[PDB]
Amino acid sequence: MKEFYISIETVGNNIVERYIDENGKERTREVEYLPTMFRHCKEESKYKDIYGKNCAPQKFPSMKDARDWMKRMEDIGLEALGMNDFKLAYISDTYGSEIVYDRKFVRVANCDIEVTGDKFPDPMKAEYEIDAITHYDSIDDRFYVFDLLNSMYGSVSKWDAKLAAKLDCEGGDEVPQEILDRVIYMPFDNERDMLMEYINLWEQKRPAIFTGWNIEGFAVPYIMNRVKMILGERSMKRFSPIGRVKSKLIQNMYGSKEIYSIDGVSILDYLDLYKKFAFTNLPSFSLESVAQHETKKGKLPYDGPINKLRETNHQRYISYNIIDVESVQAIDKIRGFIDLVLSMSYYAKMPFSGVMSPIKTWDAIIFNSLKGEHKVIPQQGSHVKQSFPGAFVFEPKPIARRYIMSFDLTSLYPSIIRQVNISPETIRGQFKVHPIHEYIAGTAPKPSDEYSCSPNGWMYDKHQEGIIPKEIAKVFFQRKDWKKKMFAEEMNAEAIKKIIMKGAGSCSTKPEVERYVKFSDDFLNELSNYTESVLNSLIEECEKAATLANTNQLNRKILINSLYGALGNIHFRYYDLRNATAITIFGQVGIQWIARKINEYLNKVCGTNDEDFIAAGDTDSVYVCVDKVIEKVGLDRFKEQNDLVEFMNQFGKKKMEPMIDVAYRELCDYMNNREHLMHMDREAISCPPLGSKGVGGFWKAKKRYALNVYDMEDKRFAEPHLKIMGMETQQSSTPKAVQEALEESIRRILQEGEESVQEYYKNFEKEYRQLDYKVIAEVKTANDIAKYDDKGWPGFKCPFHIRGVLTYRRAVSGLGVAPILDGNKVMVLPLREGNPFGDKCIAWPSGTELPKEIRSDVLSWIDHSTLFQKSFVKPLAGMCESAGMDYEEKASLDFLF
Amino acid sequence: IIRQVNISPETIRGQFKVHPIHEYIAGTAPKPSDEYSCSPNGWMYDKHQEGIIPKEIAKVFFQRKDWKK
Amino acid sequence: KRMEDIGLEALGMNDFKLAYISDTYGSEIVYDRKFVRVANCDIEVTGDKFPDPMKAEYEIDAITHYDSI
């Protein structure tokens, strides 16, 4: 196979690189790199810069020589062209051509750690002890488990595999058997031996990419702080193959935590990878909920705080962590995220960790393309931070819109990038600036005829294609090609399964198999001339090829989606404030333009005037509300929801292409570009169920609403699915039972009608009173109690939770219960005025129950009324007031005339 | 405190079972150690070798005393 | 820089001024206050606008400089 690397780093005047040799074995080499820099030249040279000026190369003998040359030509006020970074230059020059790789060869390690502690174990200080370490090695495909037997928290027994494999009722933990087939378990009596064994295990099998769920937040820091605090820095630095473990301190978002960097292994936090490369939103991003979402496999419920688990049934503890690491692997097996990171790294010819930063990725790819085109990139200009106006958010009228067709165009910012061709050399000057409303209404004349136009007052070329548009075109063509390859792989795989269940009894031999291309019929016959084992190998190969196609396709997708955020950042090598402002305000101008055109055309077609049809909207989405066409055609014509959906789909199909084309060709000739790529679709629809009196879709606030979608992007649903955001259905401040109740109420108001919501209100209101008092008690933190107490009675400015704690202490005076301690958590149950305890609330310690003697007296005297309203009534009020709806009725309007 | 507890970057010898501070304040907590000195943040420093920082503190103290005399 | 790239500790005083003082004096230093030239300066500039430390626009009319020796 081709020579492909694992990880490159810089050590002094040398480039060190861990790679895979020609025979599939891991090796390490050290090369004294000779950087080749560039500078401006008056003489004729074949190397021409971005603008077109001739430039001359220059070789250098040392790393420091090149750096000092850059500094010295910087301080004399002269510009030096090329790349300041050198690892990218080395990797680009060494390989040059596109590289191939085998995912099996690269060692992908997974880690997870469990630390028993009195208080939350703090990764930065790492004061507690490690007793659970599960390291998953890929090529060895092994779950190495390190357990600490004799800790300072009391010695415990030894883990048993067969016991854990059993069902939980006999005392097991239900770990799947194939997992225990690979669990290499080792106990340790003392911490030093276990940590040293982990160190030497890292040494023997050095990971190439070292991941885990929330790893740089809790795992990496804790392990390294503990090895520093136990063994010393001289062993802490043994993690890296080059002996360099430098600690970065910032995490400037709140300045809370610290990240780590082991020079030689590419740390890649799986939590960040999921957060950035999933396009999904969840109420909580903790491993358990997302694992349930992804693999539909939670773990057996447990009891008590985690801190005491090690001392109660440590067995389960260790088994718990063993399913912890697998869950992550499961997610990988569903998403192929590490295959994606390998694909991007080897497509951009760049180090692995750069995947975290879109700017580095884009710089690498654009430099590689330009170097392939014999050009030179400019020096990274230094600019100050000048924030530009944000997103043009439409104004939503809090009104219920029954028939609302929503749509947003594809790659808004990337498409605009070809509308204005904004590369640094493409600027051509400025023109006379009109008010923005003039361009919105089109009253301004043509800014320029032979030169392109942008609403930011600036002007760009038309015949000279920019380098950034060239990269956009290349990546977009690659994405289209790989989507075609996906279709090819899909029907090839279905042909293979057709061959499989047709039947094939013959010889066994693997033929000349191809990838990412369509399979011929004669090839299908040849595969039918092979055994069912060979057929299984063939479907495995087809599935692997399809997964690689997915990695490539979503690679292109995220590159395109990240270019916009790359261009607007200061440190990007081709930042232009004019370009960023043009991009943003052109997006605003385009969405306003299409909103106005929608209003005009819908008024003309309906025959009315001055009517507004556009609802709320973002910088790319315009949820126009169109119900006039439905009533205009005649609601009686439709007998089923499917017929109405199909009719409005045909209306959208006949309305989008011609209207959008005419509403964008004039803007295209205004802007004077080569061609208008800018276009929307009919992605989303919504409609209240036929024959019902539900509102269908309302609008509570900006980006806070609900709809009953029938068809997302031609994915029809037999029953309508509710799409909800903004409200507390997804907000975890309220309990989960009320979350279910709110989502059900939302469904009822959208679809069923008024009386349904009234009945559900009354039903839940009856059902809430007898619900268990544990879940309907508010979680609060009990602190600084002694300050707010007055001889065991409430004092000045006594907090509500502290008030409840004081009432509890008064009530449990003489009950023989443990007192509430400062810093503890308490569930609070408010009380009505006049209780024998003489106060409006009570609070009891976390994880415990109310005392039996006073439990009945409390329960008979609790005030659930104001809690119910705060946890359930609040939302309905907003939607019903914003949907022309009532949430409880006490007037007739019927009994009289 | 630095001179008495014998605290220095080189006299660290491990940690012990930390108890909550209010348990130490009332004196009901168990004896943290017998072999080396201890500090109620939950750390343990050797009793015998006087640290460099305590040594310099003692030097400066003695200079202070002789100069004031 | 070379040893830091390797990652091994480079012990010793990183600032060489302290190394010079430690090496070339060694014994307790004896000094006299009549040889240290300590200076006290004060300024007064006549100008309509409030004085701006960076602009340095006006001339200087009153300067006073006190020397100890």
PDB file of N, CA, C and O in Angstrom, chain A residues 491-532:
ATOM      1  N   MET A 491     -27.371   0.989  -5.384  1.00  0.00           N
ATOM      2  CA  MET A 491     -28.032  -0.027  -6.196  1.00  0.00           C
ATOM      3  C   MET A 491     -27.097  -1.183  -6.528  1.00  0.00           C
ATOM      4  O   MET A 491     -27.580  -2.287  -6.800  1.00  0.00           O
ATOM      5  N   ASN A 492     -25.776  -0.990  -6.444  1.00  0.00           N
ATOM      6  CA  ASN A 492     -24.871  -2.132  -6.527  1.00  0.00           C
ATOM      7  C   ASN A 492     -25.088  -3.084  -5.358  1.00  0.00           C
ATOM      8  O   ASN A 492     -25.142  -4.304  -5.541  1.00  0.00           O
ATOM      9  N   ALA A 493     -25.223  -2.542  -4.145  1.00  0.00           N
ATOM     10  CA  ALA A 493     -25.450  -3.384  -2.975  1.00  0.00           C
ATOM     11  C   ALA A 493     -26.793  -4.095  -3.058  1.00  0.00           C
ATOM     12  O   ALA A 493     -26.913  -5.264  -2.667  1.00  0.00           O
ATOM     13  N   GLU A 494     -27.824  -3.403  -3.552  1.00  0.00           N
ATOM     14  CA  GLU A 494     -29.107  -4.081  -3.712  1.00  0.00           C
ATOM     15  C   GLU A 494     -29.034  -5.161  -4.788  1.00  0.00           C
ATOM     16  O   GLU A 494     -29.664  -6.215  -4.649  1.00  0.00           O
ATOM     17  N   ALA A 495     -28.241  -4.946  -5.843  1.00  0.00           N
ATOM     18  CA  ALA A 495     -28.009  -6.011  -6.813  1.00  0.00           C
ATOM     19  C   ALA A 495     -27.291  -7.194  -6.173  1.00  0.00           C
ATOM     20  O   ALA A 495     -27.597  -8.353  -6.474  1.00  0.00           O
ATOM     21  N   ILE A 496     -26.322  -6.920  -5.297  1.00  0.00           N
ATOM     22  CA  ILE A 496     -25.593  -8.001  -4.639  1.00  0.00           C
ATOM     23  C   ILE A 496     -26.527  -8.813  -3.749  1.00  0.00           C
ATOM     24  O   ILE A 496     -26.458 -10.045  -3.721  1.00  0.00           O
ATOM     25  N   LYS A 497     -27.406  -8.143  -3.000  1.00  0.00           N
ATOM     26  CA  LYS A 497     -28.346  -8.894  -2.168  1.00  0.00           C
ATOM     27  C   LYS A 497     -29.369  -9.643  -3.019  1.00  0.00           C
ATOM     28  O   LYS A 497     -29.839 -10.719  -2.619  1.00  0.00           O
ATOM     29  N   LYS A 498     -29.715  -9.106  -4.195  1.00  0.00           N
ATOM     30  CA  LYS A 498     -30.525  -9.873  -5.137  1.00  0.00           C
ATOM     31  C   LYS A 498     -29.807 -11.150  -5.560  1.00  0.00           C
ATOM     32  O   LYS A 498     -30.405 -12.233  -5.589  1.00  0.00           O
ATOM     33  N   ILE A 499     -28.517 -11.041  -5.878  1.00  0.00           N
ATOM     34  CA  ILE A 499     -27.725 -12.226  -6.198  1.00  0.00           C
ATOM     35  C   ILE A 499     -27.728 -13.197  -5.024  1.00  0.00           C
ATOM     36  O   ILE A 499     -27.820 -14.417  -5.204  1.00  0.00           O
ATOM     37  N   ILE A 500     -27.633 -12.665  -3.804  1.00  0.00           N
ATOM     38  CA  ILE A 500     -27.543 -13.511  -2.618  1.00  0.00           C
ATOM     39  C   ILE A 500     -28.812 -14.332  -2.441  1.00  0.00           C
ATOM     40  O   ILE A 500     -28.758 -15.559  -2.287  1.00  0.00           O
ATOM     41  N   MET A 501     -29.977 -13.680  -2.467  1.00  0.00           N
ATOM     42  CA  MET A 501     -31.170 -14.470  -2.182  1.00  0.00           C
ATOM     43  C   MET A 501     -31.722 -15.162  -3.422  1.00  0.00           C
ATOM     44  O   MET A 501     -32.673 -15.944  -3.299  1.00  0.00           O
ATOM     45  N   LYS A 502     -31.159 -14.901  -4.607  1.00  0.00           N
ATOM     46  CA  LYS A 502     -31.471 -15.744  -5.759  1.00  0.00           C
ATOM     47  C   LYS A 502     -30.917 -17.153  -5.578  1.00  0.00           C
ATOM     48  O   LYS A 502     -31.597 -18.137  -5.892  1.00  0.00           O
ATOM     49  N   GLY A 503     -29.698 -17.270  -5.078  1.00  0.00           N
ATOM     50  CA  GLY A 503     -29.042 -18.556  -4.894  1.00  0.00           C
ATOM     51  C   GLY A 503     -27.849 -18.691  -5.827  1.00  0.00           C
ATOM     52  O   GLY A 503     -27.935 -18.398  -7.026  1.00  0.00           O
ATOM     53  N   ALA A 504     -26.721 -19.142  -5.272  1.00  0.00           N
ATOM     54  CA  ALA A 504     -25.483 -19.250  -6.045  1.00  0.00           C
ATOM     55  C   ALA A 504     -24.630 -20.364  -5.443  1.00  0.00           C
ATOM     56  O   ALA A 504     -23.959 -20.154  -4.428  1.00  0.00           O
ATOM     57  N   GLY A 505     -24.659 -21.538  -6.074  1.00  0.00           N
ATOM     58  CA  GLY A 505     -23.792 -22.635  -5.687  1.00  0.00           C
ATOM     59  C   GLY A 505     -22.723 -22.912  -6.725  1.00  0.00           C
ATOM     60  O   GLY A 505     -23.019 -23.445  -7.799  1.00  0.00           O
ATOM     61  N   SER A 506     -21.477 -22.562  -6.417  1.00  0.00           N
ATOM     62  CA  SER A 506     -20.397 -22.599  -7.397  1.00  0.00           C
ATOM     63  C   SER A 506     -19.063 -22.540  -6.657  1.00  0.00           C
ATOM     64  O   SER A 506     -18.998 -22.767  -5.445  1.00  0.00           O
ATOM     65  N   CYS A 507     -17.991 -22.262  -7.398  1.00  0.00           N
ATOM     66  CA  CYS A 507     -16.661 -22.144  -6.818  1.00  0.00           C
ATOM     67  C   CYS A 507     -16.547 -20.873  -5.973  1.00  0.00           C
ATOM     68  O   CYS A 507     -17.456 -20.040  -5.923  1.00  0.00           O
ATOM     69  N   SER A 508     -15.401 -20.728  -5.309  1.00  0.00           N
ATOM     70  CA  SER A 508     -15.142 -19.607  -4.407  1.00  0.00           C
ATOM     71  C   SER A 508     -13.835 -18.936  -4.807  1.00  0.00           C
ATOM     72  O   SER A 508     -12.762 -19.535  -4.676  1.00  0.00           O
ATOM     73  N   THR A 509     -13.922 -17.696  -5.288  1.00  0.00           N
ATOM     74  CA  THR A 509     -12.742 -16.919  -5.650  1.00  0.00           C
ATOM     75  C   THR A 509     -13.129 -15.449  -5.720  1.00  0.00           C
ATOM     76  O   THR A 509     -14.140 -15.106  -6.341  1.00  0.00           O
ATOM     77  N   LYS A 510     -12.338 -14.592  -5.085  1.00  0.00           N
ATOM     78  CA  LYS A 510     -12.615 -13.161  -5.130  1.00  0.00           C
ATOM     79  C   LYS A 510     -12.197 -12.592  -6.483  1.00  0.00           C
ATOM     80  O   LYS A 510     -11.047 -12.780  -6.900  1.00  0.00           O
ATOM     81  N   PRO A 511     -13.088 -11.902  -7.192  1.00  0.00           N
ATOM     82  CA  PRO A 511     -12.718 -11.325  -8.490  1.00  0.00           C
ATOM     83  C   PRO A 511     -12.053  -9.965  -8.361  1.00  0.00           C
ATOM     84  O   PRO A 511     -11.779  -9.499  -7.251  1.00  0.00           O
ATOM     85  N   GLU A 512     -11.792  -9.320  -9.497  1.00  0.00           N
ATOM     86  CA  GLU A 512     -11.275  -7.958  -9.503  1.00  0.00           C
ATOM     87  C   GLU A 512     -12.375  -6.988  -9.091  1.00  0.00           C
ATOM     88  O   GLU A 512     -13.190  -6.571  -9.921  1.00  0.00           O
ATOM     89  N   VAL A 513     -12.409  -6.632  -7.812  1.00  0.00           N
ATOM     90  CA  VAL A 513     -13.479  -5.814  -7.263  1.00  0.00           C
ATOM     91  C   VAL A 513     -13.086  -4.343  -7.335  1.00  0.00           C
ATOM     92  O   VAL A 513     -11.939  -3.963  -7.083  1.00  0.00           O
ATOM     93  N   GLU A 514     -14.057  -3.501  -7.686  1.00  0.00           N
ATOM     94  CA  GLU A 514     -13.854  -2.067  -7.823  1.00  0.00           C
ATOM     95  C   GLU A 514     -14.668  -1.333  -6.766  1.00  0.00           C
ATOM     96  O   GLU A 514     -15.552  -1.906  -6.123  1.00  0.00           O
ATOM     97  N   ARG A 515     -14.360  -0.048  -6.589  1.00  0.00           N
ATOM     98  CA  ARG A 515     -14.990   0.767  -5.561  1.00  0.00           C
ATOM     99  C   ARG A 515     -15.467   2.088  -6.150  1.00  0.00           C
ATOM    100  O   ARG A 515     -14.900   2.598  -7.119  1.00  0.00           O
ATOM    101  N   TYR A 516     -16.525   2.633  -5.542  1.00  0.00           N
ATOM    102  CA  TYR A 516     -17.085   3.939  -5.898  1.00  0.00           C
ATOM    103  C   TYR A 516     -17.460   4.031  -7.376  1.00  0.00           C
ATOM    104  O   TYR A 516     -17.462   5.118  -7.956  1.00  0.00           O
ATOM    105  N   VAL A 517     -17.776   2.896  -8.002  1.00  0.00           N
ATOM    106  CA  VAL A 517     -18.210   2.864  -9.392  1.00  0.00           C
ATOM    107  C   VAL A 517     -19.351   1.867  -9.531  1.00  0.00           C
ATOM    108  O   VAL A 517     -19.534   0.972  -8.702  1.00  0.00           O
ATOM    109  N   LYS A 518     -20.127   2.036 -10.599  1.00  0.00           N
ATOM    110  CA  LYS A 518     -21.250   1.145 -10.859  1.00  0.00           C
ATOM    111  C   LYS A 518     -20.752  -0.226 -11.302  1.00  0.00           C
ATOM    112  O   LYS A 518     -19.751  -0.340 -12.015  1.00  0.00           O
ATOM    113  N   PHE A 519     -21.459  -1.269 -10.874  1.00  0.00           N
ATOM    114  CA  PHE A 519     -21.076  -2.643 -11.175  1.00  0.00           C
ATOM    115  C   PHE A 519     -21.851  -3.143 -12.388  1.00  0.00           C
ATOM    116  O   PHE A 519     -23.078  -3.015 -12.445  1.00  0.00           O
ATOM    117  N   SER A 520     -21.130  -3.710 -13.352  1.00  0.00           N
ATOM    118  CA  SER A 520     -21.743  -4.168 -14.589  1.00  0.00           C
ATOM    119  C   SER A 520     -22.555  -5.442 -14.362  1.00  0.00           C
ATOM    120  O   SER A 520     -22.386  -6.154 -13.367  1.00  0.00           O
ATOM    121  N   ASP A 521     -23.452  -5.721 -15.312  1.00  0.00           N
ATOM    122  CA  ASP A 521     -24.280  -6.920 -15.226  1.00  0.00           C
ATOM    123  C   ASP A 521     -23.439  -8.187 -15.329  1.00  0.00           C
ATOM    124  O   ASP A 521     -23.717  -9.183 -14.652  1.00  0.00           O
ATOM    125  N   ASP A 522     -22.415  -8.176 -16.187  1.00  0.00           N
ATOM    126  CA  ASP A 522     -21.527  -9.329 -16.283  1.00  0.00           C
ATOM    127  C   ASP A 522     -20.765  -9.541 -14.982  1.00  0.00           C
ATOM    128  O   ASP A 522     -20.510 -10.683 -14.579  1.00  0.00           O
ATOM    129  N   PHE A 523     -20.394  -8.451 -14.307  1.00  0.00           N
ATOM    130  CA  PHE A 523     -19.797  -8.576 -12.981  1.00  0.00           C
ATOM    131  C   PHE A 523     -20.782  -9.198 -12.001  1.00  0.00           C
ATOM    132  O   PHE A 523     -20.397 -10.009 -11.150  1.00  0.00           O
ATOM    133  N   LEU A 524     -22.063  -8.833 -12.107  1.00  0.00           N
ATOM    134  CA  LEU A 524     -23.082  -9.444 -11.258  1.00  0.00           C
ATOM    135  C   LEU A 524     -23.198 -10.939 -11.527  1.00  0.00           C
ATOM    136  O   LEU A 524     -23.351 -11.735 -10.595  1.00  0.00           O
ATOM    137  N   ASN A 525     -23.131 -11.340 -12.799  1.00  0.00           N
ATOM    138  CA  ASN A 525     -23.159 -12.764 -13.127  1.00  0.00           C
ATOM    139  C   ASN A 525     -21.934 -13.481 -12.569  1.00  0.00           C
ATOM    140  O   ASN A 525     -22.040 -14.601 -12.051  1.00  0.00           O
ATOM    141  N   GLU A 526     -20.762 -12.849 -12.665  1.00  0.00           N
ATOM    142  CA  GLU A 526     -19.552 -13.440 -12.103  1.00  0.00           C
ATOM    143  C   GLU A 526     -19.680 -13.619 -10.595  1.00  0.00           C
ATOM    144  O   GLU A 526     -19.254 -14.641 -10.045  1.00  0.00           O
ATOM    145  N   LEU A 527     -20.260 -12.632  -9.910  1.00  0.00           N
ATOM    146  CA  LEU A 527     -20.503 -12.768  -8.478  1.00  0.00           C
ATOM    147  C   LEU A 527     -21.527 -13.858  -8.189  1.00  0.00           C
ATOM    148  O   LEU A 527     -21.426 -14.548  -7.167  1.00  0.00           O
ATOM    149  N   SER A 528     -22.515 -14.023  -9.070  1.00  0.00           N
ATOM    150  CA  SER A 528     -23.436 -15.149  -8.971  1.00  0.00           C
ATOM    151  C   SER A 528     -22.740 -16.477  -9.224  1.00  0.00           C
ATOM    152  O   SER A 528     -23.283 -17.528  -8.871  1.00  0.00           O
ATOM    153  N   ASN A 529     -21.558 -16.452  -9.838  1.00  0.00           N
ATOM    154  CA  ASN A 529     -20.742 -17.644 -10.012  1.00  0.00           C
ATOM    155  C   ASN A 529     -19.815 -17.896  -8.825  1.00  0.00           C
ATOM    156  O   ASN A 529     -18.788 -18.564  -8.986  1.00  0.00           O
ATOM    157  N   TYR A 530     -20.166 -17.395  -7.640  1.00  0.00           N
ATOM    158  CA  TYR A 530     -19.370 -17.579  -6.435  1.00  0.00           C
ATOM    159  C   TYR A 530     -20.259 -18.051  -5.290  1.00  0.00           C
ATOM    160  O   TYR A 530     -21.488 -17.976  -5.359  1.00  0.00           O
ATOM    161  N   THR A 531     -19.617 -18.540  -4.230  1.00  0.00           N
ATOM    162  CA  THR A 531     -20.332 -19.130  -3.107  1.00  0.00           C
ATOM    163  C   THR A 531     -21.025 -18.056  -2.271  1.00  0.00           C
ATOM    164  O   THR A 531     -20.779 -16.855  -2.409  1.00  0.00           O
ATOM    165  N   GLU A 532     -21.906 -18.519  -1.378  1.00  0.00           N
ATOM    166  CA  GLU A 532     -22.601 -17.610  -0.473  1.00  0.00           C
ATOM    167  C   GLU A 532     -21.647 -16.961   0.522  1.00  0.00           C
ATOM    168  O   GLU A 532     -21.910 -15.850   0.989  1.00  0.00           O
TER     169      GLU A 532
END
